[PDB]
């Protein structure tokens, strides 16, 4: 009953994202169920003061499920070759109601991400990767 699917998202000019601590970047909705819609939320300058030095990344259930939803997820960044880097997964499955989010306050250190030597912002583009495995009922 496990449905697996992935979503990728390239944010242009990421270093120019004027968002401050608490401000949000929202992905588009994605799915494949075709009715169960999800979205990604990014805090470029951290969610709170504890995660001020980090970027936060969350998976959000948008639609209203007709049954109970439990999902595993994995976030990663794609380098210029499309390879997954800096992966971080939930390990366990989490219950999702409409509007519920799960993710990582400290997904990646802002200094590691913004350092050109690490090559995770090619052409100032941040490409985020999310893989979800979900079971309804």
């Amino acid at each position: 009953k496990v449905v697996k699917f992935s979503y990728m998202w390239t944010i242009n000019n990421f270093s120019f994202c004027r968002e401050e601590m608490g401000e949000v970047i929202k992905s588009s909705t994605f799915s494949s169920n075709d009715k169960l819609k999800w979205c990604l939320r990014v805090n470029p300058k951290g969610l709170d003061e504890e995660s001020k030095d980090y970027l936060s990344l969350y998976l959000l259930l948008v639609s209203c499920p007709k049954s109970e939803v439990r999902a595993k997820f994995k976030f990663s960044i794609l380098n210029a070759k499309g390879e997954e880097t800096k992966a971080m997964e939930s390990q366990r499955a989490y219950r999702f109601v409409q509007g519920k989010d799960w993710g990582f306050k400290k997904f990646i250190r802002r200094n590691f991400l913004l350092d050109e030597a690490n090559g995770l912002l090619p052409d100032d583009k941040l490409t985020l990767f999310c893989e979800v495995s979900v079971v309804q009922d």
Partner: peptide, 7 residues
């Protein structure tokens, strides 16, 4: 572990 911003 993963965290949430919701109860």
């Amino acid at each position: 572990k993963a965290d949430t911003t919701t109860p």
